Amino acid sequence: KVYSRCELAAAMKRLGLDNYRGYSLGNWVCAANYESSFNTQATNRNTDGSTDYGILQINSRWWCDDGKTPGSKNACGIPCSVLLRSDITEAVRCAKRIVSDGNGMNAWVAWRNRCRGTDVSKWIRGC
Ligand SMILES: [Cl-]
């Protein structure tokens, strides 16, 4: 499932991301846009044997278990497959853990490069 910008905004707001750890809804929407193009089925293979999964491209070295990432730690206590669902509940729960890990949303490289220090409220225009 690939979300539309407003459909994702509503889902993320329903699941408590607006102003979570001080990050407005637009930040989260922007991050999803650049991390995955709103695609819950997105996967990206990395050189270390990890993969980034889902709409917020959560990494399998640290956060979820994909059964094939050497040295993986599974801090969200989930199989990575639950991050490939249309239902973003598990992705949001894990994202809340990631954003609380000491660097805010800088954990998402695409957010840092493309969203941070921009006017992110445009991501919720018309929603
Ligand atoms: Cl916003």
Author numbering: 1 to 127
Extract from the study:
In general, the duck isoforms contain approximately 20 amino-acid substitutions (of 129 positions) relative to the chicken enzyme, and were thus considered to be likely to maintain essentially the same fold.
When lysozyme from duck eggs was first analyzed, it was noted that the most striking differences between the enzymes from ducks and chickens, apart from ducks having multiple isoforms, were the complete absence of any histidine residues in the duck variants (which at one stage was incorrectly suspected of being a requisite for catalysis) and the increased amounts of arginine relative to the chicken counterpart. These findings have been verified by our structures of DEL-I and DEL-III. The only difference between TEL and DEL-I adjacent to the mutated surface of HyHEL10 is lysozyme position 101 (glycine in TEL, aspartate in DEL), although we predict that the aspartate side chain in DEL-I would not sterically preclude the binding of DEL-I to this HyHEL10 mutant.
